[PDB]
């Protein structure tokens, strides 16, 4: 869903709210990939 919004963003970006929204989306996607990779590293999971 977040990547669908990211590709739904416009092609030319110059406004400050547009840049802020783009950067927030990019950081969200990066952190989502980090969590998915951490979970997908191995099969069995123990938590504290």
């Amino acid at each position: 869903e977040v990547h669908k919004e990211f590709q739904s963003l416009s092609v030319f970006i110059d406004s400050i709210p547009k840049k802020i929204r783009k950067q927030r989306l990019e950081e969200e996607m990066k952190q989502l990939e980090h969590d998915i990779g951490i979970i997908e590293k191995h099969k069995i999971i123990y938590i504290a």
Binding site: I38, I39, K41, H42, I44, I45, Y46, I47, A48
Partner: peptide
């Protein structure tokens, strides 16, 4: 080979 999560 074991994942640990806080």
């Amino acid at each position: 080979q074991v994942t640990i999560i806080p």
